[PDB]
Design a protein around this ligand. Structure first.
Ligand code: TE9
Ligand code: TE9
Ligand code: CL
Ligand code: CL
Ligand code: MG
Ligand code: MG
Ligand code: MG
Ligand code: MG
Ligand code: MG
Ligand code: MG
Lengths: 724, 724
DNA sequence: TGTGGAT
DNA sequence: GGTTATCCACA
DNA sequence: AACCGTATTAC
DNA sequence: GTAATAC
């Protein structure tokens, strides 16, 4: 069932037949249609393939995707491998040219390297190179078949026999249809491969183990050492026909691309605005579509589709799940999406599909985006270069800490817990006035996490270590109480539980203790949570030792868990483990660039308007003259020229004058224009003051953060205790 | 697997317990969250329940959702059924306030009448009753939430001292949060129910057997008699807590409600433009989003999502499948959507999902929308009154016959085959000139269908009967030829096959014949189809009987099939069986409304412009006064007045004068404006003539159809034959 | 059997 | 990203 | 519309 | 034996 299905070739012929291993069933469709059916076979691969150098060995044979791969090859596996039993001469890996494409290239080549080495050794394993670009100056002129793999090959296609043409930028084999696929990547004549070889069994064995085995730090190190986080990778210039390449440099090249991408652009939040790229995109798109808190809800599907076609070239479920998460107030301390309908529960029951639900940005999420229009924040091109997207949001509140971030990259993970908005702002304000402020002091203002699930946080000294180093283990325990019953009889009653825990799975594990009678005294386990409150009720027998039970539960269930801080985020393009200080200063530095840029923006604006008001005031005093002059001019350009020569209007002033609608001659109040002149001069002064004086700027940073606090502050939810 | 999964209630109190039956798992969850877990259980339904008449038993008693329905209630199957054993004292059917809500209500009430009567007579089966509207908005501490079931209760809530606060118009249970759901339709206190009774076994064995039994024609008849297509049905006002209705007026209203909707607004094409509503909404949406043939492709999920949030409240796969079909050139004779990627194949291998594919309208699809921006067509309010959509498209070509339509409805279906564009035009064009033209005459121009898949149509008479009455059975036969082989051998070479036949499945069924040796002579079946060409070779044994084989294949496989014209369409809102004539006159009448409407639009434009230009030419001669006048005036609107009163300009002319930019005063060339008068006056003449002179109009209708023909004509694909 | 818009 | 059900009318 | 797999870090 | 963005 769980394997991808095989489409054979028509002819049994080991000497020239090909098995295409294709990324995903959709692309298997296109491959199955563009193929030559007599010597080309197809096995679709169902997303990410197992790791045969992490996962076990019973696992590796239960893996259906593997078993069907071994089957179809018809050679045997590892210690039973015969090369002349094999049904194909070429095993051809063919993936999207996305970076997960690279990840799959990686994952296969290990399996094969490890369990089919003579097949790798005899150079039977290849890789298909799909194109990146397509060029057409036709469609009823004729067409102009033209493709490109390198930005260099593309720049060559500014020639060909036509211009003003199109350039389709491919994002998968999904977007290619049979004819496109045959020519470009499947037809022996035209297609372009690479053969995978073994140059050095030492240097190539080594490369795999580090990259693909479960030692995380040699991997982190390989990434530290090899990956350029701050640089591009001016790629190879695509040799014709086939091209030999070491397993070594491939597992290298490919895993470097995958590692880098998921570190920078997937699983790790940016240190300033606290968003993963997918989440930033949700916010930006839903903002641009005016899907804000003040206006109407909006079908989730519409939202998700726009996000996927404009910014985020990934699956719809990835986006809907991300959007939905931002809407749940047991995951986010401050929700960035409001959403009508079923957005799940704490029992983790599935949210309603995006066809049902509807949604819009939360009020506070407007503040992450505040002043994005005012050139505060560096924009870059979307995946196809139709449209720009922000690399980071203004962030008028310190989201990273408030809402935290839990993610898993390559060579790195991250747990940052949520915090109280007020508390986080208090620290930051202090640090604005005290650059060198140290933990002990900051912790007067930010004592610890504030989970939206509430609960009891235990381990003040481990908080400190996490706030210093970025790592530390703290304890979270459910809010419990006792209640009496008839028959005397007590019952334990749970109202808050640990963050990231599934209520139904917890109730079940508890009840499994009762059933297994691991600790004497439990009668019934009842979930009594209605829509308004959480309320698990553990009912004990007649004279049960209330507190001995409670203890086994904490110990041996998830009624108590340890939260583990591992605070990683992206500083200056790079993954970084970080405590409260770099986080808070990073933010402050960010708000500084924003307030400064917003001020320059607003100021250049105000000056233009001033220069015009200046001109319009003068015009009124010579209005007859100005009109007679426009009447005596030949055209628009002439008039402007006359106005400058005869009256010294600037270009800007003349253009504005020349384009006043006639009805504007009704409003000629010079007193009212003067009032406006005053207001502009003052605005410019205030804005020049900010730009001119760090402290004038910092005091505004603080003024704003205080307003945000006042507008959005809510009580702590999790109580802090010291002993553990 | 398969069946909606049960969520038990906490204590077994069959005195007061309630099994809620909820349309879908997404709403199932919402109900779960919103319930009182003590005495309310939740069985969700996975959409359409089996019909308990139609579906004959054994299939019924393995139907997973049915098993898990009887299991739950813990009573039995009418005969063994025992009210006293039952786990619930109310079975409450809860469905979307939608029209499939109605169909599902309908489907269940058969199962209860027909295998569980005692529950229904006793009054233990109830109904749902979600609200249709929610009103108001007034901060946080709110002062402004009330709901609404009827149109009548809307006037009620519009009345609130404050201002006009915001209105939600619910589209199902998947847009309702669990508080909203408990409070409005699940709390016994506040909820409102319909108790289902049996008020005469007689009038609810006739009513339940007509509506849901095998005989189409009584149901067709019932609808024909009872259902008012051209008329609304807003009636029943909302009463006190519980209300009574009989199993008659429930069945009646609900299946009537349903059948109306899916006859009109789903499964049957409109006779003018040949479109089902989803297809028209696809076109109109994509078109309005500038997603046209001339601009570049665009992610499918973006198009689909905008269709669903704007026009079509239904499933994304229902929408995407329709879109994919319109792109498939073996289902449509003139594709309306161009889709890049895996858009299926003839073997019916699944198309890539909407995240992979991208798409835009074909060029000819633009001709269905031609002149839509010129008030050429009635528009309605969309499903939530945020936007407007066309009830019918301009249809600059006769799409209904050209692409045909295959649909299934209630007490009605529709098979219309596709025709060749050029031939359909030729017949319409003749019939413009000869309204009383007979079939034999039209059939000179339009002899029979033209399938995209081609093949051989045999049966001139039944073609003629279909073209007369709307019904008729024709033979579609695959195109074949015989090819010699090595050493006294033959093979059959299939090169075209019948419309709607999956090639893979056919090749399968032919191979199965060989395997079982139903007829003798078959060596091998080889699908030799590739990207460029269709080619099935059936390779015969030495001295087999090519004829006996072939004719056995035509007979017992789908290498030849029967096509049954069942030409049904919507004419004046009612379903109607039609032949060529009422089809072609429907179109000609439409193009008439369109050409006229359009011409009035373009003429209103040109008069406005002309009048303005008159006013401008005048203005020159009083320029100094107009200027003096406009400076004097207190404001814009004031200065317009003074222009009218003082100088005798229309509103139109004054508004244009008053919004001239100052630089227009440089232009005193009346001559260019006079050439423009001239050209405008001529244009208005051409236009007004079309409006005044029926023939002038028709000659245009003809000119234009001829242009379409010439631009889009393609050779016939199916050959015709007359008898065998 | 299977068509094609729906749950 | 495959997979699994139902309804509806008509061979 | 639920249900199934994988990579990735890290308890 | 789970978290959360990806195939
Ligand atoms: N056939 C293919 N499927 C997937 N894929 C995508 C999912 C998504 O878009 O969210 C998903 O949720 C998903 C779940 C699965 F359980 C799953 N598998 C069960 C096994 O059969 C594999 C797979 Cl594979 C899944 C893919 F990304 C690519 C595919 F080709
Ligand atoms: N859970 C529910 N699912 C459906 N539903 C919707 C589908 C769609 O919108 O494209 C679909 O393709 C689909 C396929 C199925 F095979 C299927 N079933 C197999 C059985 O488990 C039912 C169901 Cl049910 C299906 C529904 F319309 C409503 C639902 F609640
Ligand atoms: Cl101005
Ligand atoms: Cl003008
Ligand atoms: Mg991809
Ligand atoms: Mg998924
Ligand atoms: Mg524990
Ligand atoms: Mg609905
Ligand atoms: Mg479906
Ligand atoms: Mg037949």
């Amino acid at each position: 069932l769980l394997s991808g299905k095989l489409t054979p070739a028509q002819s049994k012929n080991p000497a020239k037949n090909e098995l295409y291993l294709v990324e995903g069933d959709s692309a298997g469709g296109s491959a199955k249609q563009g193929r030559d059916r007599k010597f080309q076979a197809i096995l679709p691969l169902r997303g990410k393939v197992i790791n045969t150098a992490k996962a076990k060995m019973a696992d590796i044979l239960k893996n259906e995707e593997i078993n069907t791969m071994i089957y179809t090859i018809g050679a045997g596996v590892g210690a039973d491998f015969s090369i002349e039993d094999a049904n194909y001469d070429k095993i051809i890996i063919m993936t999207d040219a996305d970076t997960d494409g690279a990840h799959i290239q990686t994952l296969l080549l290990t399996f094969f390297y490890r369990y089919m080495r003579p097949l790798v050794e005899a150079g039977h394993v290849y890789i298909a190179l799909p194109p990146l670009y397509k060029m057409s100056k036709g469609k009823g002129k004729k067409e102009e078949v033209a493709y490109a793999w390198t930005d260099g090959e593309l720049e060559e296609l500014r020639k060909q026999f036509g211009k003003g043409a199109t350039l389709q930028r491919y994002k998968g084999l999904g977007e290619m249809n049979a004819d496109q696929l045959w020519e470009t990547t499947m037809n022996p004549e035209t297609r372009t491969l690479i053969r995978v070889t073994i140059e050095d069994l030492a240097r190539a064995e080594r490369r795999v183990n580090v990259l693909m085995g479960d030692k995380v730090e040699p991997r982190r190190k390989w990434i530290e050492d090899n990956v350029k986080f701050t640089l591009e990778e001016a790629t190879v210039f695509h040799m014709s026909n086939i091209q030999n390449m070491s397993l070594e440099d491939i597992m290298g090249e490919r895993f470097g691309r995958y590692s880098k991408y998921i570190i920078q652009d997937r699983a790790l939040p940016d240190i300033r605005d606290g968003l993963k790229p997918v989440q930033r995109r949700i916010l930006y798109s839903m903002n641009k579509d005016s899907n804000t808190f003040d206006k109407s809800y909006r079908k989730s599907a519409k939202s998700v589709g726009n996000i996927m076609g404009n910014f985020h070239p990934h699956g719809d479920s990835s986006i809907y799940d991300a959007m939905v998460r931002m809407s749940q107030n047991w995951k986010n301390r401050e929700i960035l999406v409001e959403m009508h309908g079923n957005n799940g529960s704490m029992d983790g029951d599935p949210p309603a599909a995006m066809r049902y639900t509807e949604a819009r940005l939360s009020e506070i999420a407007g503040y992450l985006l505040q002043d994005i229009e005012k050139k505060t924040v560096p924009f870059a091109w979307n995946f196809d270069d139709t449209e720009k997207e922000p690399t980071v949001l203004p962030a008028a509140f310190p989201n990273l800490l408030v809402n935290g971030s839990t993610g898993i990259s390559a060579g790195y993970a991250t747990d940052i817990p949520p915090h109280n908005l007020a508390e986080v702002i208090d620290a930051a304000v202090y640090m604005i006035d005290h650059p060198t402020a140290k933990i002990d002091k900051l912790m007067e203002f930010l004592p610890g996490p504030d989970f939206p699930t509430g609960a009891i946080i235990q381990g003040r000294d481990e908080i400190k270590k996490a706030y210093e180093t970025g790592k530390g283990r703290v304890v979270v325990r459910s809010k419990t109480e006792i209640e009496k019953l008839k028959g005397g009889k007590e019952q334990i009653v749970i109202t808050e539980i640990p963050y990231e825990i599934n209520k139904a799975n917890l109730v079940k594990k508890i009840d499994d203790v009762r059933v297994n009678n691991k600790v004497a005294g439990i009668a019934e386990v009842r979930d009594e949570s209605d829509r308004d409150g959480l309320r698990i009720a553990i009912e004990l027998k007649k004279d049960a030792n209330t507190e001995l039970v409670l203890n086994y539960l904490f110990k041996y269930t998830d009624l108590q868990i340890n939260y583990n801080f591992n605070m990683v985020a992206i500083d200056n393009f790079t993954p970084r483990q970080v405590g409260i200080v770099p986080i808070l200063s990073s933010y402050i530095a960010h708000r500084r660039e924003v307030i400064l840029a917003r001020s320059r923006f607003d100021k250049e604006k105000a000056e233009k308007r001033l220069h015009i008001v200046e001109g319009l005031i003068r015009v009124i005093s010579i209005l007859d003259e100005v009109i007679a002059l426009i009447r005596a001019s030949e055209n628009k350009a002439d008039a402007k020229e006359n106005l400058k020569v005869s009256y010294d209007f600037t270009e800007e002033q003349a253009e504005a004058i020349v384009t006043l609608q006639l009805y504007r001659l009704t409003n000629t109040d010079v007193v009212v224009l003067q009032e406006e002149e005053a207001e502009l001069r003052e605005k410019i002064a205030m804005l020049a003051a900010i730009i001119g004086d760090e402290r004038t700027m910092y005091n505004l940073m603080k003024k704003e953060l205080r307003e945000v606090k006042k507008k959005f502050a809510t009580p702590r939810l999790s109580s802090l205790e010291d002993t553990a």
